[PDB]
Amino acid sequence: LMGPRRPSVVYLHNAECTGCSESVLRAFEPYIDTLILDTLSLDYHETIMAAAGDAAEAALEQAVNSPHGFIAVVEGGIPTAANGIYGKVANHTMLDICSRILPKAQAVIAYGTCATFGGVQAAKPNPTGAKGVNDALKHLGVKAINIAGCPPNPYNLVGTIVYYLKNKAAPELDSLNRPTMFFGQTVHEQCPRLPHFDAGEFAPSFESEEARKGWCLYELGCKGPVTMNNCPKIKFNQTNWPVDAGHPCIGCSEPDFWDAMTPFYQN
Amino acid sequence: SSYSGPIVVDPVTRIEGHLRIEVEVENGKVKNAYSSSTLFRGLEIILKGRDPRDAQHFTQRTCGVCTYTHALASTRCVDNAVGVHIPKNATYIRNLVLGAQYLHDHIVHFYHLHALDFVDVTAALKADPAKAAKVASSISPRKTTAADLKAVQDKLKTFVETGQLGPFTNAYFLGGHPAYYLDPETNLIATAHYLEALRLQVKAARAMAVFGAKNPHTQFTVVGGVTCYDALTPQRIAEFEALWKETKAFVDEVYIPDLLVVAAAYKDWTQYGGTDNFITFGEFPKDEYDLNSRFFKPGVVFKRDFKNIKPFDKMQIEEHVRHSWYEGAEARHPWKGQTQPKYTDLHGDDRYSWMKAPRYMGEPMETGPLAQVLIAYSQGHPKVKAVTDAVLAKLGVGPEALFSTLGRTAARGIETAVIAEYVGVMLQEYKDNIAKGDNVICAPWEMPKQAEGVGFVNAPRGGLSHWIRIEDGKIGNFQLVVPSTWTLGPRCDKNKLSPVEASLIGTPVADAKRPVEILRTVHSFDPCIACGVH
Ligand code: SF4
Ligand code: SF4
Ligand code: F3S
Ligand SMILES: [Mg+2]
Numbered sequence: 001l002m003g004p005r006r007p008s009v010v011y012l013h014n015a016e017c018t019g020c021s022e023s024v025l026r027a028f029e030p031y032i033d034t035l036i037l038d039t040l041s042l043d044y045h046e047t048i049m050a051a052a053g054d055a056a057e058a059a060l061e062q063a064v065n066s067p068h069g070f071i072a073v074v075e076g077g078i079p080t081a082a083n084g085i086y087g088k089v090a091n092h093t094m095l096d097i098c099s100r101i102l103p104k105a106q107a108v109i110a111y112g113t114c115a116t117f118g119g120v121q122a123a124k125p126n127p128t129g130a131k132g133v134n135d136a137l138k139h140l141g142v143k144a145i146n147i148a149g150c151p152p153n154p155y156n157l158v159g160t161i162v163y164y165l166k167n168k169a170a171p172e173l174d175s176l177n178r179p180t181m182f183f184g185q186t187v188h189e190q191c192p193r194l195p196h197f198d199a200g201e202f203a204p205s206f207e208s209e210e211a212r213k214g215w216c217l218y219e220l221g222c223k224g225p226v227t228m229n230n231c232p233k234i235k236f237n238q239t240n241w242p243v244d245a246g247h248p249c250i251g252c253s254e255p256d257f258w259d260a261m262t263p264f265y266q267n
Numbered sequence: 268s269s270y271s272g273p274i275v276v277d278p279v280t281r282i283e284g285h286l287r288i289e290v291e292v293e294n295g296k297v298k299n300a301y302s303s304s305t306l307f308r309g310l311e312i313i314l315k316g317r318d319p320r321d322a323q324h325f326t327q328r329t330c331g332v333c334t335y336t337h338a339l340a341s342t343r344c345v346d347n348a349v350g351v352h353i354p355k356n357a358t359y360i361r362n363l364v365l366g367a368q369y370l371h372d373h374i375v376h377f378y379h380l381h382a383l384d385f386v387d388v389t390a391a392l393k394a395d396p397a398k399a400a401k402v403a404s405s406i407s408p409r410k411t412t413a414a415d416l417k418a419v420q421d422k423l424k425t426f427v428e429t430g431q432l433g434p435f436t437n438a439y440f441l442g443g444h445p446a447y448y449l450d451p452e453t454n455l456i457a458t459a460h461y462l463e464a465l466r467l468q469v470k471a472a473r474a475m476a477v478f479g480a481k482n483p484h485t486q487f488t489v490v491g492g493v494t495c496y497d498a499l500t501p502q503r504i505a506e507f508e509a510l511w512k513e514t515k516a517f518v519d520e521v522y523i524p525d526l527l528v529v530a531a532a533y534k535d536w537t538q539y540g541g542t543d544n545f546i547t548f549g550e551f552p553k554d555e556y557d558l559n560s561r562f563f564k565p566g567v568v569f570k571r572d573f574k575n576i577k578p579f580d581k582m583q584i585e586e587h588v589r590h591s592w593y594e595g596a597e598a599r600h601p602w603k604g605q606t607q608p609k610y611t612d613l614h615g616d617d618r619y620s621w622m623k624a625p626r627y628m629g630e631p632m633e634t635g636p637l638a639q640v641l642i643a644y645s646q647g648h649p650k651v652k653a654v655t656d657a658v659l660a661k662l663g664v665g666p667e668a669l670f671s672t673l674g675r676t677a678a679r680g681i682e683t684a685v686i687a688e689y690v691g692v693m694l695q696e697y698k699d700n701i702a703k704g705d706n707v708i709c710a711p712w713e714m715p716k717q718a719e720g721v722g723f724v725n726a727p728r729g730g731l732s733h734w735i736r737i738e739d740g741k742i743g744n745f746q747l748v749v750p751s752t753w754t755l756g757p758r759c760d761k762n763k764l765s766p767v768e769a770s771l772i773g774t775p776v777a778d779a780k781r782p783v784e785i786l787r788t789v790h791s792f793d794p795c796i797a798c799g800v801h
Pocket of ligand 1: 015016017018019020021054075076111112114115119120149150151152329484626
């Protein structure tokens, strides 16, 4: 799978919906083919790898034990309840898999709010005791770079990897371990509707002429003011983002947002 | 020379989610099978007590491959519960984003999830690009030259001689494999198109964000309609239309010809992976409250009796737990559903999966493109009939060939082709409606204190239903019954094998260490375990 020349990436899937994986496939300039053939060596990835079963387990072992070293990218929360039983791969709990592999990585990136902070399955009452990577593995000294969002902007993953490869270090991180180059501003301070906000010009309903006219979505629940992300700047798929589609921000790059930001249509 | 004994495939890769497949092999053929889903999240438990308006944001996160589908199902479900009839334009926009989801999903499934079961990428290195170009140009109106395919070969050569095979590490085809049949040139064409599809899918997904804010995980639906006033503008409609047009060209000119070339080379695969019973919910409504207003209509078929399609009765669905890791053994209709995890480890108390086992009138039912296509055909759907018949004639096979792994794979292509065309029809109707001066996209509604609702989506993997019981204006019960739950859940309390389990019986396996034949059948159902278990 690996060796020298391209940096080895091991991509793990814990308790996840595969939306973070899909977001990376939307990579643009560079595209995912450039990333996989030229930039990186993608040495394990359950969604797209050819090997399955024992052959896939062997490819994972080969990648993790490489003298050349590897980068881990982790999608999904780690279920920790009932000794990790709620999530297994190859009959190993996800907690055990991550506890064994992540301390061997040269760097770990937690990709998506599930891997950074626990995510949707950690929402109350958290029946599987799902935890973010750094929370679950604090004891092992794992300190993943957290790229949050549900799913994050793939621009933020690629920018973080490129930085790491160039500088041999993590970029400046905020107090949630997210890179300040992407997460340093609220969604709200970047939003085109901020003049209506300042003017107290709020849509009272989605059917209203005020919503048609693009008035602020704060009264309809928008969490832009308490959410850190670069959505209005970079946008998604080179073309849009939630408020420009007329829907409030649901706070999806914040910890515990499923419980902190709900009801989503209230402020 | 043929293996007797167990084979375990864990993880099953090139699916969504965490699947363990177990088989018993006798004399080189599968005689028994178990479909074991090995992650649980419990979204139904998490939803209890919450605002019904919030359900679609949580359930969308059931799955990011079949992104949007669950937001759509939950929103249809809560729309239904509150009794709102959304405006025509909300129906059009929702329908258009769903049609775009199918095209993205099926193109990625064929190339990036399924094709490595059939395509030896490293043999593409020994192909003659000039011969390969001639073959590629014979099967498509798109002209491919020798230089075009050499560029691909040059790029692959450099990748392979680096020794870092990445996603091709330990592939079942490395060094050759008796169940891989393609010649080098066909491997090179398929590989070229795999790579091409990696960039094309970016545009197919972008089509959803034009109206739907972003992909993955759209953010434009609300109870009552949609939020995206910008979707009414000629600029956004034009942007959507251009992405759709390019995506449809790729379906017509690259995916379907490739599908046919591979199916022709693997015609033995009409002999494996058949199933008996089919269910489909219909999709792309004119009337949100009438399934029979959908472009594809609902139906149920037992024992391949397509001459006697039965009406779909939503009250005949029960989800079993006797072979699942939940409390007890009682099957439940989803408006009386229960999600009470109780793990017993693999085959502990004869339980082996986190999926429930949905049964329709007690029977295991395949859902997905092969159900939608066959039932639509049988209902006289003219577009489905014209495409299916032309595929059958190109392959030189009879309709019976459809009841197989190859047939299911072909049906996913037929449905992609048919939906790609129909998106243009919906788009034009949408445009026509705007031109009449209807600019309304959301309707007002009120939250009842007590209600029941159900939302039906025919997703790229089949019939999806979300079920809500509202109590004191909050979520009293919320149950998802997802297409992969139907197809890949375990046995029921009558011990009937699920569609995937049953389909696996009779599978030949040439090399037990590299059981690509099991992957071909399992991948032909396009499993989604995050969907199936939620
Ligand atoms: S962060 Fe969101 S999109 Fe990513 S795996 Fe979790 S639920 Fe899915
Ligand atoms: S729509 Fe949201 S992010 Fe934009 S100005 Fe209003 S509250 Fe802020
Ligand atoms: S919901 Fe998420 S994608 Fe951006 S606009 Fe809000 S942080
Ligand atoms: Mg369910």
